C-alpha cells in the first residue's frame, strides 16, 4: 500500500511545500506523480520517479529515497488547489496512494443562514420538511445542529451535506429535518444552530407554527 | 489530436449486467497498453484492470477477481469491459488510459501519460421517480435586510441532475442553486433559492422551472407571500 | 594424384604389406604383437583398447569425477573380435568421407608428406637416426614354414581405439627421456610419430541457442557432431606434431575460488588456434609472436643440423633422396656454399599455414557440417550412432545431411528433434558426471551449466615490459591467419613428390615407459551449505512436477520450493488467470488470454537514455535471475541506470592496468649517415604496442566477462523453458475436467495455440540475446577500451620527450637537410590516437 498521510497540506501562495509518499519494501519500482481536479481529467506530473514530461512547468520535481518517495513544487499559485496521488507498483498489478489535497490561499468568511418553515402545500400533503441553507463561508468546515424549543434533535431524521466549493471560492451547505405533523404543531419553536469557528461564531434562526 | 471516448453506463440494478466501452482516436492503437481505472463517490483512486495492446495481457485487482473481465477489438479500435453480479460498492467514475511511449516499441512495462473524461456507473436500489415540487414563500422572518429570501424545494427524486431555472431564464442573478443532499431511502433533494428585493413582493410574480431529464417530468410551480 | 584408401576385413589373414603384426612404440622390446592395417600411406591402424601406462580398474565408471565435462565408461568396448572388425570398417568409410572432399584431401596430403626428421635434439649431428621407438616400430614376418622375422617400418600416425573414456579423443606425442626430463620432438620442429586413440560412436552434442541468426520455424534445438569431423579435427594435432610445432604453454587456468564457477581441464594454446573462430584471439597477439620465434629458431637449428649430415645408420638409405624432401618439408633454401638456410618469407607462409590453417569451423563449411560458434557453447549429454554403416543414415558424401532425404536443409540430419533414427541415448551406467550440491533442501547441479571463469595469473604481461629500439630492430606481423581457400588452391598445383621405401632396420635403442594415466576419478561429491538464495534455487523453484497434478503459479520463490504443485514466475498477469478456474465460459476467451497473455509478458524491449550501446533492455531479467541491488526489489531498470551494465556479472572484476614502460632508445652510434632508420623504428614499434594491449583486452574479455553473459541466455531459455512447460500442462488439465459438448470440435484450436507459446518465447529469446550480446559489446568499447585508452595516452607523452631528447642529442647530423624542421611537423599523427576495432576493420576511403 501506498500512504499519503495526512491526506491534507496547506501552504501560503508562492512557497515551498512537499508531499511526501511512503511505501514499504514490496514495491522498488518506478512512481508517478498526477495532479487532479474533479472537473477534469488527471495530468501527468512526475513519471519514473525523477522524469517530468514536457508541458509541465519548471515547478513540479521531486525524489525518493529507499522506501519514501516525495513529490516537490514551487512557487505555489491558486491554480495549483488540487489533490496529488502518488502511483507505483508490486509483483502484480498498479497501486495507488490514497491521494494528497492541497490547499493555497483562504479567508475567514461568516455564513449566512437561512432556515424556512414547512410551506402551506406539504402539510395538506401529509409531509414535513425542514430547510437550512448556509452559504458563503470559509473555512469549509461547520457543525450544524437541530434544536425542539430546547431539546437537541441532531441525527433525528437530519440529513446534512457536505461542503462544496462555489465558483466564487466559498463554500455552502445544506441540512434538512424531516418531521410528521404534529411535531410540528406540538412544540413551539424548532432552532437550526450552526458553528463556524472561522471567529468563534454560531448563529441560530428559528421559525414557529403559525406565530402570526 | 490525440483523444479517447468512453460510453456505456447509466444507472442499474444489483446483480444485473452493463457492458462499457473506450474508443480510441488520433493513434495507432494496436501499440499500447491501455488500463481501466475508477474512483468512488468519496475514496481516492483505485486501479482496477490493465489490458494489453495484443488484445493480450491483463490483470485484475483483487476486488473484481472473477466477477469482470477486458477484451479489446483490434479491427475495430476498441476495447471494453465487462461488468457481471453489480454490487453497491461499484459506483463512481471510470476511466481509460493508455501508457506513453509506446510509440518506441508496445510492451513498454510501468507507464501512462493521458485518460479520456469518463462516464458515470451508478448503482442502487430506488427507482426513477419525478419530483415533488412545492413553493417556499419569504416572510419576516427571513426578509429585508434590505432584501428578501424564498426557493422552491424539489422533493424526492432519483437519478441526478435536475436542471432548474426560474421565470424561463430572464432571471440569473441572485441565483443559489445548492448541490443535492443523498438521503436514506436512496432518493435526492437540492433547493433553489434567489436573492430578491422584498418591498415589491405580490406585485412582480415568481416561477421556478423544475426538469427532471431522466423522468420527463416537467414542473412550473409559482411563489407567493402569504398573510397567517 | 588422387589418394587411395585400402579396404580389409578383420579375419582377413596377415600379408607382410598391408595387415601385419606390430610393436607399438611403448612396446619396444617387449616381444607383445597386435595386428595392424595399414589405411593409407604412412597411417596405420590397430583395432585394440588403449591400455599404455593404465591400470585394469582405470576403465570402470567412477561414482563422480574430478574436472570436466560428463565421460562414458565400458570396458567391454572393442573386446570381440565382431567389435573390432566393425571399428576397422567404421574407420575406413570415415576416412573415404573425408577423401571425397578436396579440403579433407589436401588435409590427408599434408599429413602423409610430413615424414618426421630422422633425429631431434638429442641425436648426432652427423648421421640420420632411425633407430629410435619414437621413429620407428617393429612387426614380425612369417615364413610359410612359421618361422618369424624381425623388421622395421616408418609411419606418420596410428590409430588405436579409446581409452577408459570413449566420448573424449585424444593425439599425442612421443615423450623422450633424456637427463630424467621428459622431452617431445613434435614441439621442437623435428616431428615424431603421432598416436590416436580415436572412438567413432560416441559423440558430443550442442544446441543452438547463442547464435545470432534465428528461423521463427527452425526454433531452438540441439544437434549431435558428425564422426568425420571429429576424425579432421584429429588429424590437424597430427598435422601440427608431424611439423614439430606442437604448443604446451601459455595455458589457461580456470577459477576454482568461487560456487558458480566452472572446474575444467586448462585450456591449452594449441587447442585454440585448432578450432578457429573469434576463440583465436584469446591468445593474445604478443604470445602468437613468442610461439612464432620459437619455431624460427627451431627451424633455424634444424637447418644447420641438416647440412651437417653425411651419412645414416641403416646402409639402404639414399642420403640424397631424404634431403630435398626436407628441403621441401621446412621450405629451405641453399646459399652459394650449399648450406641450408631459413627464407624467412617462406617460413611464414609455412608457419601460418600448419597453426591457423586447418579449422573445424572452416572444415566445417566445405563439408556443410554444422558447428558451434563458441568454444564456450553448452555441452549436452553425449549419444551414440550405431548404424554408422549403413547408408540410409551416413555416407561417405554427404555423411547425415543427405539431400535425397530432404536432410541437407538447415542441417537437419545432425537435429536431434528431427533426425530421431541416426542417434540413441547412452546408458546410464556408464555415464559419469561431476555434481555439486546447494544445500538450504539440497540440489544437485552438473559441471556443464555453470559459468567458466579463468585467472588473471594465466594473461601475459610482457606489453608491460622494457622494450628496447635500436637501428636493427625489425617489426612484429600482426599477421596470424592463412586461408582454407589458399591452402586448397596450392594444393592443386602441387608436383606429385614420392615419399621411399618406408622400411628399415630394426628399434635397439628407445625406452618402453609410457606416461602415467591421469585419473579423473572421485569419490564424493561437493556438498555446499549456503544461507541465501542464489539464481539455481530461482530455476529450481520453476520446475513443473513430473505428474498429472493440478499446479499453481505464484510470485513467492519459497513458495515453489517448499510447495510440490506450485511453480514460480515473473509474469504477474499471467499467474492473475492459469490459477482463476474459467467456470461457465469458453475455452475460446478463456485459452486465447492466455496465449497471448504469455505473449505481451515476454518479448518486452526498453532502451536507457545513459546507455546509448545497448538498443535492447528485456526488464524481467532481474526476477527471473535473483539479479537485484540493495533497495532494488523488482526495479531492474533503476539498477541499471545507476551501476549499468555491470550489474549482469555475477562476478565484477578489476579493470585497471599497471604500468605501460616507456619506449629506450640504445643505437647511440652515428657513425654511418642516414641513421633514421631508428626513428622509424621507434614510430613504427611504438604503434604495435597500442595493438598489443588493445588485443591483450580483448583477449581477457572473452575468457572472463563474455561467459557470464553467454550463460544469462542459457540461464534465461531455460527459464523461458519452465514457464511454456508449465503453461502448457495448467492448460491440460482445464481440459479433461471440461465437459461441454463443443469438446471435441475445439481440439485442435487447443493445440493450435500452444504451438503460439513456443513462437512468442523464441521471439523474447531474439530480444534476450540483442540484449546480452549488445550489453557485453558495451562494457568492453567504453569502459576497459577508455581505460586501456587512458594511460596508455601516458606512455605517448612519455616516449617523444625521450624521443625528442634523442633528436635534439643528434641533431648536428640531420639538420639543413629538410629533415628536421619536417620531422617536427611530422609529429602530428602523434597527437592522433588509434582507436579500437571490435569487430571488422572498415576503411571507406
Known amino acids: ?84 496521488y502518488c502511483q507505483q507498483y508490486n509483483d502484480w498489478p498498479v497501486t495507488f496512494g490514497q491521494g494528497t489535497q492541497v490547499e493555497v490561499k483562504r479567508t475567514v468568511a461568516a455564513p449566512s443562514v437561512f432556515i424556512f418553515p414547512p410551506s402551506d402545500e406539504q402539510l395538506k400533503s401529509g409531509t414535513a420538511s425542514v430547510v437550512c441553507l448556509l452559504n458563503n463561508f470559509y473555512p469549509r468546515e461547520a457543525k450544524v445542529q437541530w434544536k425542539v424549543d430546547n431539546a437537541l434533535q441532531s441525527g433525528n431524521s437530519q440529513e446534512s451535506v457536505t461542503e462544496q466549493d462555489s465558483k466564487d471560492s466559498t463554500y455552502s451547505l445544506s441540512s434538512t429535518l424531516t418531521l410528521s405533523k404534529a411535531d410540528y404543531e406540538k412544540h413551539k419553536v424548532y432552532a437550526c444552530e450552526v458553528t463556524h469557528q472561522g471567529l468563534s461564531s454560531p448563529v441560530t434562526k428559528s421559525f414557529n407554527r403559525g406565530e402570526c | 489530436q490525440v483523444q479517447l471516448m468512453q460510453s456505456g453506463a447509466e444507472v442499474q440494478k444489483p446483480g444485473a449486467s452493463v457492458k ?56 475495430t479500435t476498441t476495447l471494453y469491459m465487462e461488468l457481471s453480479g453489480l454490487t453497491s460498492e461499484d459506483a463512481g467514475v471510470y476511466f481509460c488510459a493508455r501508457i506513453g511511449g509506446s510509440t518506441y516499441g508496445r510492451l513498454m ?46 422533493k424526492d427524486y432519483f437519478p441526478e441532475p435536475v436542471t432548474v431555472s426560474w421565470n424561463s431564464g430572464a432571471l440569473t442573478s441572485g441565483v443559489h442553486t445548492f448541490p443535492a443532499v443523498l438521503q436514506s431511502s436512496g432518493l435526492y433533494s437540492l433547493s433553489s433559492v434567489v436573492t430578491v428585493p422584498s418591498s415589491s413582493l405580490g406585485t412582480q410574480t415568481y416561477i421556478c422551472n423544475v426538469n427532471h431529464k431522466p423522468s420527463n417530468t416537467k414542473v412550473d410551480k409559482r411563489v407567493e407571500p402569504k398573510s397567517c | 594424384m588422387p589418394i587411395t584408401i585400402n579396404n580389409f576385413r578383420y579375419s582377413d589373414p596377415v600379408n607382410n604389406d598391408t595387415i601385419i603384426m606390430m610393436e607399438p612404440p611403448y612396446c619396444k622390446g617387449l616381444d607383445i604383437y597386435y595386428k595392424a592395417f595399414k589405411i593409407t600411406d604412412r597411417i596405420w591402424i590397430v583395432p585394440e583398447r588403449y591400455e599404455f601406462g593404465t591400470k585394469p580398474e582405470d576403465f570402470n565408471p567412477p561414482s563422480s569425477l574430478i574436472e570436466g565435462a560428463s565421460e562414458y565408461y565400458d570396458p567391454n568396448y572393442l573386446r570381440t573380435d565382431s567389435d573390432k572388425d566393425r571399428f576397422l570398417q567404421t574407420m575406413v568409410k ?160 580456470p577459477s576454482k575460488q568461487e560456487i558458480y564457477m566452472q572446474h575444467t581441464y586448462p585450456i591449452s594454446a594449441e587447442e585454440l588456434f585448432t578450432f578457429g573462430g573469434q576463440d583465436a584471439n584469446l591468445i593474445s597477439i604478443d604470445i602468437k609472436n613468442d610461439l ?65 590453417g586447418f579449422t573445424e569451423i572452416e572444415l566445417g563449411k566445405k563439408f556443410n557440417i554444422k558447428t558451434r560458434l563458441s568454444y564456450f557453447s553448452m555441452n549436452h549429454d553425449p549419444v551414440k550412432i550405431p548404424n554408422l554403416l549403413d547408408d540410409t543414415i551416413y555416407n561417405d558424401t554427404e555423411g547425415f545431411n543427405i539431400e535425397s532425404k530432404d536432410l541437407k536443409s538447415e542441417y537437419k540430419g545432425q537435429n536431434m528433434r528431427v533426425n530421431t533414427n541416426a542417434f540413441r541415448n547412452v546408458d546410464g551406467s556408464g555415464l559419469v558426471s561431476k555434481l555439486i550440491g546447494l544445500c538450504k533442501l539440497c540440489i544437485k547441479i552438473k559441471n556443464e551449466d555453470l559459468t567458466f571463469i579463468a585467472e588473471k595469473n594465466s594473461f601475459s604481461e610482457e606489453p608491460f615490459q622494457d622494450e628496447i629500439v635500436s637501428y636493427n630492430t625489425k617489426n612484429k606481423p600482426l599477421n596470424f591467419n592463412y586461408s582454407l581457400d589458399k591452402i586448397i588452391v596450392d594444393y592443386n598445383l602441387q608436383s606429385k613428390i614420392t615419399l621411399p621405401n618406408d622400411r628399415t632396420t630394426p628399434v635397439t635403442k628407445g625406452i618402453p615407459y609410457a606416461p602415467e594415466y591421469k585419473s579423473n576419478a572421485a569419490s564424493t561429491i561437493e556438498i555446499h551449505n549456503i544461507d541465501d538464495n542464489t539464481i539455481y534455487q530461482y530455476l529450481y523453484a520453476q520446475k513443473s512436477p513430473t505428474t498429472l497434478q493440478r499446479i499453481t503459479m505464484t510470485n513467492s520463490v519459497d513458495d515453489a520450493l517448499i510447495n510440490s504443485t506450485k511453480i514460480y514466475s515473473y509474469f504477474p498477469s499471467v499467474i492473475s488467470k492459469v490459477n482463476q478456474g474459467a467456470q461457465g465460459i469458453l475455452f475460446l476467451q478463456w485459452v486465447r488470454d492466455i496465449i497471448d497473455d504469455f505473449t505481451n509478458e515476454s518479448s518486452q524491449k526498453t532502451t536507457i537514455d545513459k546507455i546509448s550501446d545497448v538498443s535492447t533492455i528485456v526488464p524481467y531479467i532481474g526476477p527471473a535471475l535473483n539479479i537485484v541491488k540493495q533497495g532494488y526489489e523488482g526495479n531492474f531498470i533503476g539498477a541499471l541506470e545507476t551501476t549499468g551494465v555491470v550489474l549482469l556479472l555475477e562476478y565484477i572484476p578489476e579493470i585497471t592496468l599497471p604500468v605501460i614502460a616507456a619506449l629506450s632508445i640504445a643505437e647511440s652510434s652515428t657513425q654511418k649517415e642516414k641513421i633514421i632508420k631508428t626513428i622509424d623504428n621507434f614510430l613504427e614499434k611504438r604503434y604495435e604496442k597500442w595493438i598489443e594491449v588493445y588485443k591483450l583486452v580483448k583477449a581477457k574479455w572473452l575468457g572472463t566477462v563474455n561467459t557470464q553473459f553467454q550463460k544469462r541466455s542459457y540461464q534465461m531459455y531455460r527459464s523461458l ?43 523474447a ?56 624542421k619536417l620531422e617536427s611537423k611530422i609529429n602530428k599523427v602523434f597527437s592522433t590516437p588509434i582507436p579500437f576495432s571490435y569487430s571488422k576493420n572498415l576503411d571507406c576511403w
Not at chain 2, 493521458?114 to 458515470?120: A, K, P, S
Not at chain 3, 540483442?770 to 568499447?781: D, G, K, P, Q, Y
Request: aromatic content about 10%; hydrophobic content about 35%; some cysteine.
Open chain 1, 1 to 84: 500500500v501506498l500512504t499519503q498521510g495526512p491526506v491534507t497540506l496547506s501552504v501560503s501562495p508562492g512557497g515551498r511545500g512537499t508531499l511526501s509518499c511512503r511505501a514499504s519494501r514490496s514495491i522498488s519500482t518506478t512512481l508517478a506523480w498526477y495532479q487532479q481536479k474533479p472537473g477534469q481529467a488527471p495530468r501527468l506530473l512526475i513519471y519514473g520517479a525523477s522524469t517530468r514530461a514536457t508541458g509541465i512547468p519548471a515547478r513540479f520535481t521531486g525524489s525518493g529515497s529507499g522506501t519514501e518517495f516525495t513529490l516537490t513544487i514551487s512557487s505555489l499559485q491558486s491554480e495549483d488547489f488540487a489533490v496529488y
Open chain 2, 20 to 75: 462499457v466501452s473506450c474508443q480510441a482516436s488520433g493513434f495507432t492503437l494496436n501499440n499500447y497498453y491501455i488500463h481501466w481505472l475508477r474512483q468512488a463517490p468519496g475514496q481516492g483512486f483505485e486501479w482496477m484492470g490493465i489490458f494489453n495492446p495484443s488484445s493480450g495481457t491483463r490483470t485484475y485487482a483483487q476486488k473484481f477477481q472473477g466477477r469482470i473481465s477486458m477484451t479489446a477489438d483490434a479491427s
Open chain 2, 109 to 154: 512495462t510501468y507507464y501512462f501519460d493521458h485518460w479520456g473524461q469518463g462516464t458515470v456507473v451508478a448503482v442502487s436500489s430506488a427507482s426513477t421517480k419525478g419530483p415533488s415540487v412545492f413553493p417556499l414563500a419569504p416572510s419576516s422572518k427571513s426578509t429585508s435586510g434590505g432584501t428578501a429570501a424564498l426557493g422552491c424545494l424539489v
Open chain 3, 94 to 253: 570415415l576416412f573415404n568421407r573425408i577423401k571425397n572432399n578436396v579440403a579433407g584431401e589436401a588435409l590427408l596430403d599434408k599429413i602423409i608428406n610430413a615424414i618426421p626428421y630422422l633425429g631431434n635434439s638429442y641425436s648426432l649431428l652427423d648421421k640420420f637416426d632411425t633407430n629410435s621407438n619414437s621413429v620407428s616400430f617393429n612387426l614380425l614376418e612369417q615364413d610359410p614354414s612359421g618361422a618369424t622375422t624381425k623388421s622395421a617400418m616408418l609411419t606418420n600416425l596410428i590409430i588405436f581405439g579409446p581409452g577408459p573414456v570413449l566420448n573424449k579423443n585424444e593425439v599425442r606425442g612421443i615423450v623422450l627421456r633424456v637427463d630424467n626430463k621428459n622431452y617431445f620432438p613434435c614441439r621442437d620442429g623435428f616431428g615424431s610419430i603421432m598416436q590416436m586413440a580415436f572412438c567413432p560412436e560416441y559423440v558430443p552434442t550442442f544446441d543452438n541457442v547463442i547464435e545470432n541468426i534465428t528461423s521463427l520455424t527452425i526454433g531452438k534445438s540441439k544437434y549431435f557432431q558428425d564422426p568425420a569431423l571429429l576424425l579432421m579435427h584429429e588429424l590437424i594435432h597430427v598435422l601440427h606434431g608431424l611439423y614439430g610445432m606442437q604448443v604446451s604453454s601459455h595455458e589457461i587456468i
Open chain 3, 292 to 356: 612464432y620465434e620459437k619455431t624460427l629458431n627451431d627451424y633455424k637449428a634444424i637447418a644447420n643440423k641438416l647440412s651437417q649430415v653425411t651419412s645414416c645408420n641403416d646402409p639402404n638409405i639414399d642420403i640424397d633422396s631424404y634431403k630435398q624432401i626436407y628441403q621441401q618439408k621446412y621450405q629451405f633454401d641453399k646459399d652459394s656454399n650449399g648450406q641450408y638456410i631459413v627464407n624467412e618469407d617462406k617460413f611464414q607462409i609455412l608457419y601460418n599455414s600448419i597453426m591457423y
Open chain 3, 721 to 763: 523453458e519452465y514457464q511454456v512447460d508449465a503453461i502448457k500442462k495448467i492448460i491440460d488439465y482445464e481440459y479433461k475436467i471440461y465437459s461441454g459438448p463443443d469438446k471435441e470440435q475445439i481440439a485442435d484450436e487447443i493445440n493450435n495455440l500452444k504451438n503460439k507459446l513456443e513462437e512468442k518465447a523464441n521471439k
Open chain 3, 765 to 820: 529469446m531474439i530480444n534476450i540475446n540483442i540484449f546480452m550480446r549488445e550489453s557485453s559489446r558495451s562494457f568492453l568499447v567504453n569502459q576497459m577500451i577508455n581505460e586501456a585508452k587512458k594511460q596508455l595516452l601516458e606512455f605517448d607523452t612519455q616516449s617523444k620527450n625521450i624521443l625528442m631528447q634523442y633528436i635534439k642529442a643528434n641533431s648536428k647530423f640531420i639538420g639543413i637537410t629538410e629533415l628536421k
